[PDB]
Short mmCIF file of C-alpha atoms and ligand atoms in Angstrom, two decimals:
data_model
loop_
_atom_site.label_atom_id
_atom_site.label_comp_id
_atom_site.label_asym_id
_atom_site.label_seq_id
_atom_site.Cartn_x
_atom_site.Cartn_y
_atom_site.Cartn_z
CA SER A 1 105.72 102.14 49.07
CA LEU A 2 103.77 99.53 47.08
CA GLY A 3 100.57 101.26 45.96
CA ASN A 4 101.90 104.35 44.15
CA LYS A 5 103.70 102.65 41.24
CA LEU A 6 103.01 103.54 37.61
CA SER A 7 101.18 100.78 35.71
CA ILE A 8 100.68 99.90 32.04
CA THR A 9 97.15 101.37 32.08
CA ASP A 10 98.61 104.80 33.00
CA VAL A 11 100.99 104.99 30.01
CA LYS A 12 99.71 107.37 27.31
CA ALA A 13 102.32 107.20 24.50
CA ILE A 14 102.55 103.67 23.07
CA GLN A 15 101.92 103.90 19.30
CA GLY A 16 105.16 103.50 17.36
CA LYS A 17 107.21 102.76 20.51
CA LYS A 18 109.65 99.88 20.96
CA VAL A 19 108.42 98.34 24.23
CA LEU A 20 110.71 96.11 26.32
CA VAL A 21 108.78 93.74 28.62
CA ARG A 22 110.33 91.66 31.44
CA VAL A 23 108.21 88.51 31.82
CA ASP A 24 108.21 85.37 34.01
CA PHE A 25 108.75 82.40 31.66
CA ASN A 26 110.46 80.08 34.19
CA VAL A 27 108.43 77.03 33.14
CA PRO A 28 109.45 73.34 33.27
CA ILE A 29 110.69 72.06 29.90
CA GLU A 30 111.41 68.41 29.08
CA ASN A 31 113.32 67.78 25.82
CA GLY A 32 111.68 70.72 24.09
CA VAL A 33 108.17 70.22 25.52
CA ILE A 34 106.55 72.58 28.04
CA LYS A 35 104.38 70.69 30.54
CA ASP A 36 102.68 73.68 32.21
CA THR A 37 101.77 76.75 30.14
CA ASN A 38 100.03 78.74 32.91
CA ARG A 39 102.80 81.34 33.16
CA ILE A 40 102.77 81.87 29.39
CA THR A 41 98.98 82.27 29.22
CA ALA A 42 99.30 84.78 32.10
CA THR A 43 101.21 87.25 29.87
CA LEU A 44 98.49 87.56 27.22
CA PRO A 45 96.76 90.65 28.72
CA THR A 46 99.99 92.69 28.69
CA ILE A 47 100.87 91.60 25.14
CA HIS A 48 97.35 92.26 23.81
CA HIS A 49 97.25 95.76 25.30
CA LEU A 50 100.55 96.74 23.66
CA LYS A 51 99.45 95.28 20.31
CA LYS A 52 96.08 97.09 20.32
CA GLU A 53 97.69 100.41 21.28
CA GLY A 54 100.01 100.19 18.25
CA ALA A 55 103.46 99.41 19.68
CA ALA A 56 106.05 99.22 16.89
CA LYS A 57 107.80 96.25 18.56
CA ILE A 58 106.96 94.10 21.60
CA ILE A 59 110.31 92.82 22.89
CA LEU A 60 110.21 90.15 25.60
CA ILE A 61 113.12 89.30 27.96
CA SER A 62 113.05 86.49 30.53
CA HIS A 63 114.91 83.50 32.02
CA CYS A 64 114.43 79.80 32.69
CA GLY A 65 116.37 76.88 34.13
CA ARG A 66 119.87 76.98 35.65
CA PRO A 67 122.44 78.21 33.07
CA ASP A 68 124.51 79.92 35.85
CA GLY A 69 125.93 82.64 33.60
CA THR A 70 127.00 80.66 30.52
CA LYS A 71 125.28 79.80 27.24
CA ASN A 72 123.66 76.43 28.01
CA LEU A 73 121.21 75.46 25.25
CA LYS A 74 119.49 72.94 27.53
CA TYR A 75 117.83 76.08 28.95
CA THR A 76 117.12 77.92 25.69
CA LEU A 77 113.86 79.87 25.56
CA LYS A 78 113.18 78.76 21.94
CA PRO A 79 110.28 76.38 22.82
CA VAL A 80 108.54 79.16 24.75
CA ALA A 81 108.42 81.31 21.61
CA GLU A 82 106.63 78.51 19.74
CA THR A 83 104.06 77.98 22.52
CA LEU A 84 103.42 81.72 22.85
CA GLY A 85 102.92 82.01 19.09
CA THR A 86 100.31 79.25 19.13
CA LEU A 87 98.44 81.03 21.94
CA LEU A 88 98.58 84.40 20.15
CA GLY A 89 97.67 83.13 16.68
CA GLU A 90 100.77 84.67 15.08
CA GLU A 91 104.46 83.88 14.69
CA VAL A 92 106.81 85.02 17.49
CA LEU A 93 110.36 85.77 16.33
CA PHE A 94 113.06 84.11 18.48
CA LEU A 95 116.55 85.65 18.66
CA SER A 96 119.68 83.81 19.78
CA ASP A 97 120.96 86.55 22.14
CA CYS A 98 119.51 89.43 24.18
CA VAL A 99 122.02 92.30 23.63
CA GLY A 100 124.22 93.80 20.95
CA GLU A 101 124.27 95.27 17.48
CA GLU A 102 123.10 92.11 15.70
CA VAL A 103 120.09 91.81 18.03
CA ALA A 104 119.14 95.43 17.31
CA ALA A 105 119.35 94.90 13.54
CA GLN A 106 117.13 91.81 13.78
CA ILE A 107 114.58 93.71 15.89
CA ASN A 108 114.45 96.55 13.36
CA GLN A 109 114.04 94.09 10.46
CA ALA A 110 111.01 92.43 12.09
CA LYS A 111 107.45 93.23 11.04
CA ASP A 112 105.78 96.27 12.64
CA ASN A 113 103.51 95.51 15.64
CA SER A 114 105.04 92.01 16.09
CA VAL A 115 106.26 90.07 19.15
CA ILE A 116 109.92 89.09 19.64
CA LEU A 117 111.39 86.85 22.38
CA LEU A 118 115.10 87.22 23.20
CA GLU A 119 117.33 84.44 24.54
CA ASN A 120 117.64 83.59 28.28
CA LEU A 121 119.05 86.57 30.24
CA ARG A 122 120.87 84.22 32.62
CA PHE A 123 123.19 83.06 29.83
CA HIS A 124 125.03 86.27 30.84
CA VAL A 125 126.82 86.36 34.20
CA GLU A 126 125.83 90.05 34.40
CA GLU A 127 122.11 89.29 34.90
CA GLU A 128 122.50 87.63 38.32
CA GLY A 129 125.94 89.19 38.91
CA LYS A 130 127.53 85.83 39.78
CA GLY A 131 127.86 82.42 38.22
CA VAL A 132 130.04 79.39 37.62
CA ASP A 133 131.94 78.53 34.43
CA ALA A 134 131.91 75.21 32.59
CA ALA A 135 134.93 73.91 34.53
CA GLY A 136 133.07 74.69 37.76
CA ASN A 137 134.99 77.75 38.93
CA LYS A 138 133.10 80.67 40.45
CA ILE A 139 132.85 83.77 38.29
CA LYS A 140 131.78 87.26 39.33
CA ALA A 141 130.76 90.25 37.22
CA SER A 142 132.49 93.52 38.01
CA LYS A 143 130.58 96.73 38.68
CA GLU A 144 131.71 97.95 35.25
CA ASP A 145 130.58 94.72 33.54
CA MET A 146 127.14 95.05 35.17
CA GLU A 147 126.81 98.65 34.00
CA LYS A 148 127.66 97.73 30.40
CA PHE A 149 125.08 94.92 30.28
CA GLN A 150 122.38 97.15 31.81
CA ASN A 151 123.15 99.89 29.27
CA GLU A 152 122.86 97.35 26.44
CA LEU A 153 119.43 96.22 27.70
CA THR A 154 118.34 99.87 27.97
CA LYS A 155 119.25 100.47 24.30
CA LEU A 156 116.74 97.80 23.16
CA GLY A 157 113.66 100.02 23.38
CA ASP A 158 111.87 103.20 24.46
CA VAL A 159 109.37 102.12 27.19
CA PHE A 160 109.89 99.49 29.92
CA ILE A 161 107.14 97.22 31.30
CA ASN A 162 108.03 94.90 34.23
CA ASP A 163 105.54 92.00 34.46
CA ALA A 164 107.80 89.66 36.51
CA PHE A 165 106.83 90.18 40.17
CA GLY A 166 108.31 86.75 40.99
CA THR A 167 111.85 88.06 40.26
CA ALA A 168 111.38 91.52 41.82
CA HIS A 169 113.01 90.46 45.12
CA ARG A 170 116.33 90.05 43.22
CA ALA A 171 118.86 92.83 42.56
CA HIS A 172 119.38 91.58 39.01
CA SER A 173 120.20 93.62 35.89
CA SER A 174 116.75 93.26 34.28
CA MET A 175 115.08 94.32 37.58
CA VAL A 176 117.16 97.39 38.51
CA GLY A 177 119.16 98.49 35.45
CA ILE A 178 116.79 99.31 32.56
CA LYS A 179 117.01 103.12 32.71
CA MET A 180 114.13 104.35 30.55
CA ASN A 181 111.94 107.38 31.34
CA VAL A 182 108.76 105.26 31.66
CA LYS A 183 109.08 102.14 33.87
CA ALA A 184 105.64 100.62 34.58
CA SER A 185 104.10 97.43 35.95
CA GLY A 186 102.42 94.97 33.60
CA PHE A 187 98.97 93.59 34.36
CA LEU A 188 100.23 90.76 36.60
CA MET A 189 102.65 92.94 38.58
CA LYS A 190 99.97 95.64 38.85
CA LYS A 191 97.57 93.20 40.55
CA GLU A 192 100.22 91.86 42.96
CA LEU A 193 101.13 95.40 44.06
CA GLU A 194 97.48 96.52 44.25
CA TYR A 195 96.46 93.76 46.67
CA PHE A 196 99.60 93.63 48.81
CA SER A 197 99.23 97.42 49.19
CA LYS A 198 95.61 96.91 50.29
CA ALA A 199 96.70 94.37 52.89
CA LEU A 200 99.78 96.12 54.28
CA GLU A 201 99.54 99.89 53.78
CA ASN A 202 96.07 101.16 54.77
CA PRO A 203 94.06 97.99 55.36
CA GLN A 204 90.41 98.02 56.24
CA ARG A 205 90.44 96.70 59.78
CA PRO A 206 90.25 94.32 61.65
CA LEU A 207 93.31 92.86 59.86
CA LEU A 208 93.80 89.10 60.46
CA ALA A 209 96.80 86.93 59.62
CA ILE A 210 96.25 83.16 59.35
CA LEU A 211 99.53 81.27 59.69
CA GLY A 212 100.26 77.55 59.52
CA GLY A 213 102.66 74.87 58.40
CA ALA A 214 105.01 72.27 59.82
CA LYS A 215 107.66 74.33 61.63
CA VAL A 216 108.24 77.51 63.63
CA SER A 217 111.78 78.34 62.51
CA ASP A 218 111.12 79.23 58.86
CA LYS A 219 108.16 81.46 59.87
CA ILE A 220 109.85 83.60 62.57
CA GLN A 221 110.65 86.55 60.28
CA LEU A 222 107.16 86.43 58.75
CA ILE A 223 105.42 86.30 62.16
CA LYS A 224 107.48 89.10 63.70
CA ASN A 225 106.89 91.45 60.74
CA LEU A 226 103.14 90.79 60.64
CA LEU A 227 102.89 91.48 64.39
CA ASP A 228 103.77 95.10 63.50
CA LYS A 229 100.67 95.32 61.23
CA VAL A 230 97.81 93.00 62.23
CA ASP A 231 95.05 93.10 64.86
CA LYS A 232 94.64 89.30 65.23
CA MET A 233 96.61 86.17 64.31
CA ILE A 234 95.63 82.49 64.03
CA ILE A 235 98.58 80.09 64.46
CA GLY A 236 97.92 76.49 63.45
CA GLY A 237 99.14 73.33 61.74
CA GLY A 238 102.14 71.35 62.94
CA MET A 239 103.94 74.43 64.27
CA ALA A 240 101.26 74.79 66.97
CA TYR A 241 102.48 71.76 68.98
CA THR A 242 105.77 73.58 69.70
CA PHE A 243 103.81 76.58 71.08
CA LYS A 244 101.59 74.39 73.29
CA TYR A 245 104.63 72.59 74.76
CA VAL A 246 106.64 75.76 75.52
CA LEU A 247 103.70 77.80 76.84
CA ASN A 248 101.62 75.20 78.73
CA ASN A 249 103.93 72.16 79.08
CA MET A 250 101.28 70.24 77.12
CA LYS A 251 102.03 66.58 76.41
CA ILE A 252 102.54 66.24 72.65
CA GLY A 253 103.38 62.55 72.19
CA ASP A 254 105.05 61.95 68.81
CA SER A 255 103.73 65.16 67.22
CA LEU A 256 106.18 67.40 65.35
CA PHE A 257 108.46 69.44 67.62
CA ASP A 258 110.80 72.21 66.36
CA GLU A 259 113.71 72.33 68.80
CA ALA A 260 115.51 75.33 67.30
CA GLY A 261 112.27 77.27 66.82
CA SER A 262 110.99 76.46 70.33
CA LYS A 263 113.62 78.87 71.72
CA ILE A 264 111.86 81.85 70.01
CA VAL A 265 108.23 81.10 71.04
CA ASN A 266 108.34 83.33 74.14
CA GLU A 267 109.75 86.25 72.10
CA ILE A 268 106.84 85.91 69.65
CA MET A 269 104.20 85.90 72.40
CA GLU A 270 105.91 88.83 74.16
CA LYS A 271 105.84 90.89 70.92
CA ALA A 272 102.15 90.08 70.46
CA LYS A 273 101.49 91.58 73.91
CA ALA A 274 103.53 94.70 73.15
CA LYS A 275 101.69 95.29 69.85
CA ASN A 276 98.22 94.49 71.28
CA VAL A 277 97.64 91.52 68.90
CA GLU A 278 95.25 88.71 69.89
CA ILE A 279 96.71 85.19 69.29
CA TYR A 280 94.44 82.19 68.50
CA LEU A 281 96.15 78.78 68.96
CA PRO A 282 94.15 75.51 68.88
CA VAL A 283 92.42 74.28 72.04
CA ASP A 284 91.86 70.70 70.78
CA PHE A 285 93.32 68.33 68.20
CA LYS A 286 92.53 65.36 65.98
CA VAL A 287 95.22 62.81 66.92
CA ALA A 288 96.34 59.60 65.17
CA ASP A 289 98.16 56.40 66.14
CA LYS A 290 100.16 56.28 62.85
CA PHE A 291 101.31 58.86 60.27
CA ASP A 292 98.73 57.63 57.77
CA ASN A 293 95.31 58.67 56.44
CA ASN A 294 93.99 55.24 57.56
CA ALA A 295 95.10 55.60 61.20
CA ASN A 296 92.92 55.16 64.24
CA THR A 297 91.91 58.64 65.41
CA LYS A 298 90.28 60.55 68.27
CA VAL A 299 89.86 64.09 69.63
CA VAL A 300 91.73 65.44 72.68
CA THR A 301 91.61 68.88 74.32
CA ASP A 302 94.60 71.03 75.27
CA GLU A 303 93.75 70.24 78.92
CA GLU A 304 94.02 66.48 78.22
CA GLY A 305 97.12 66.70 76.01
CA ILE A 306 98.33 63.97 73.66
CA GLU A 307 99.35 60.58 75.00
CA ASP A 308 102.66 58.85 74.28
CA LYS A 309 102.99 57.38 70.77
CA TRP A 310 100.03 59.39 69.30
CA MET A 311 100.47 62.44 67.07
CA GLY A 312 98.28 65.46 66.33
CA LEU A 313 97.52 66.01 62.61
CA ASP A 314 94.62 68.53 62.44
CA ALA A 315 92.81 71.12 64.53
CA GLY A 316 89.93 69.70 66.58
CA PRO A 317 86.21 70.58 66.45
CA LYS A 318 86.24 73.28 69.14
CA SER A 319 89.24 74.99 67.49
CA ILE A 320 87.37 74.90 64.17
CA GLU A 321 84.30 76.46 65.80
CA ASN A 322 86.57 79.17 67.26
CA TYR A 323 87.49 80.20 63.68
CA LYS A 324 83.99 81.61 63.06
CA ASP A 325 84.02 84.75 65.20
CA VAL A 326 87.67 85.48 64.35
CA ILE A 327 87.45 85.18 60.55
CA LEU A 328 83.94 86.52 59.91
CA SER A 329 84.64 89.74 61.87
CA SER A 330 87.78 90.54 59.82
CA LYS A 331 87.81 92.94 56.87
CA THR A 332 91.30 92.06 55.59
CA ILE A 333 92.76 88.54 55.72
CA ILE A 334 96.34 87.44 54.93
CA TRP A 335 96.50 83.63 54.78
CA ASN A 336 99.87 81.81 54.69
CA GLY A 337 99.54 78.19 55.82
CA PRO A 338 97.14 75.23 56.09
CA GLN A 339 95.82 74.26 59.54
CA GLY A 340 96.54 70.51 59.33
CA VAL A 341 97.85 67.75 57.05
CA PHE A 342 95.46 68.71 54.25
CA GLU A 343 96.94 66.19 51.78
CA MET A 344 95.31 63.41 53.86
CA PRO A 345 91.50 63.74 53.59
CA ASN A 346 90.85 62.67 57.19
CA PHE A 347 93.15 65.51 58.38
CA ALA A 348 91.88 68.18 55.92
CA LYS A 349 88.69 69.33 57.70
CA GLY A 350 90.33 72.16 59.66
CA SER A 351 91.85 73.64 56.50
CA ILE A 352 88.67 73.20 54.45
CA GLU A 353 86.49 74.90 57.07
CA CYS A 354 89.03 77.75 57.32
CA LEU A 355 88.74 78.15 53.53
CA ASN A 356 84.92 78.16 53.67
CA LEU A 357 84.94 80.95 56.29
CA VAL A 358 87.48 83.06 54.37
CA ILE A 359 85.21 82.79 51.31
CA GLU A 360 82.15 83.80 53.34
CA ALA A 361 83.92 86.89 54.73
CA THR A 362 85.12 87.85 51.24
CA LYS A 363 81.59 87.62 49.82
CA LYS A 364 80.49 90.10 52.51
CA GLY A 365 83.20 92.61 51.57
CA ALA A 366 86.49 91.40 53.09
CA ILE A 367 89.73 91.41 51.08
CA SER A 368 91.45 88.00 51.19
CA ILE A 369 95.05 87.38 50.07
CA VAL A 370 96.67 83.93 49.80
CA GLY A 371 100.46 84.02 49.88
CA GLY A 372 101.35 80.91 47.88
CA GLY A 373 102.80 77.47 48.45
CA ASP A 374 100.63 74.86 50.14
CA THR A 375 97.79 77.35 50.78
CA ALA A 376 97.50 78.06 47.04
CA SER A 377 97.51 74.29 46.41
CA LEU A 378 94.64 73.84 48.88
CA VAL A 379 92.62 76.58 47.15
CA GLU A 380 93.28 75.05 43.71
CA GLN A 381 92.40 71.51 44.81
CA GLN A 382 89.09 72.79 46.25
CA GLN A 383 88.49 74.72 42.98
CA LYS A 384 87.98 78.05 44.79
CA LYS A 385 90.55 80.41 43.21
CA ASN A 386 87.82 82.77 41.96
CA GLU A 387 86.42 83.08 45.51
CA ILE A 388 89.62 84.61 46.99
CA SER A 389 90.45 88.27 46.27
CA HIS A 390 94.05 87.50 45.29
CA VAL A 391 96.05 84.26 45.12
CA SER A 392 99.64 85.42 44.63
CA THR A 393 101.92 83.68 42.13
CA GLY A 394 105.02 85.61 43.27
CA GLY A 395 106.68 82.74 45.12
CA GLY A 396 109.77 83.91 46.96
CA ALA A 397 109.06 87.58 46.25
CA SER A 398 105.69 87.32 48.02
CA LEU A 399 107.31 85.78 51.08
CA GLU A 400 110.04 88.46 51.19
CA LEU A 401 107.38 91.18 50.95
CA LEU A 402 105.39 89.70 53.84
CA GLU A 403 108.64 89.44 55.85
CA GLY A 404 109.11 93.21 55.44
CA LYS A 405 112.04 93.07 53.00
CA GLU A 406 112.72 95.51 50.16
CA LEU A 407 111.97 94.41 46.58
CA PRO A 408 114.55 95.99 44.21
CA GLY A 409 112.36 95.46 41.13
CA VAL A 410 109.48 97.34 42.77
CA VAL A 411 111.67 100.21 44.02
CA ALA A 412 112.95 100.71 40.44
CA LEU A 413 109.46 101.35 38.96
CA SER A 414 108.28 104.87 38.13
CA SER A 415 105.94 106.67 40.51
CA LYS A 416 102.34 107.52 39.61
BR1 BR B 501 88.18 61.22 65.49
K1 K B 502 95.92 94.34 75.33
#
């Protein structure tokens, strides 16, 4: 289950505790400079709550870069400690390792109620379980080595807060091995679990999935899992041309065609029938004579098809009108994919109108969840993040969850 996990706001005994917090600090760093601080700013609510409630120590563990299980100072977390300190208005102590007797002594020496950041977990092969040494030979951590590292992390504190939803799809030591009595979500993880639970567990219906993107093949697992849950599904973007060809023998010209994925289209449509899900594919298209925003364009229906040497790049006007009754009648919406080549303004109208309708439904009480990737980029570029119920920042963990896979870091949390 997703919605019954203990969260930071449920924890009663904090004053005087040593609190270990797993955070997501995987930010790009260029010769000691951090170019995007969004993920660091995102941790401030969890840190402030622990400070105000009187924690004796706030001990942060995280990873960045690609050390592959050896100490590689190109990927040191040191610059993150400086940036976090500037955002907090106080000094953050940075320690050169994350386990052992010297780390413990340095933690105990630190000022009461202060914040401490430990060095990159992935310097240790035991975090991921596998790695590659400096000479380039594969190394593997034994079951006993893993247990020892997890025990050493567990000795660091008294209460565990996991605020790193974006790593929770991994069976890594900091996700599954910190064996404290209280294991609770931080504010970011709490919100991810709250909204994915609302979408997948007991959704207010009708439940609609909006899917899109370039290809069929990478979306097969996502589509098949969502067909077990939803009432309706829009399928759009470049992947739609493969459906129209297989199902109706529609002429597609030079539009994108997914040969490997085409072989699974009939299985998808057959599962939609068996689960009583209504499918909404486009019935017209904006086509172009060149893969370019400046191309000559026109509109063709699915009865006309697309002539040789032209390519479809957005949903057409009738397809866009068909969005209205589908989206506005839905009370939960899961959106994973633009409906055309939204990076080219002349091929963005389908995606922008989809966004406007999702916002309208949300204002009238629907719950809207955006999965990530290009859809999140569209929302950000239109400056509409505050108009969607939840834009996930979980990356690969969000996709695995929507595919129906188990998240080890979520399973390991305490129950409410
Ligand atoms: Br046109
Ligand atoms: K039916």
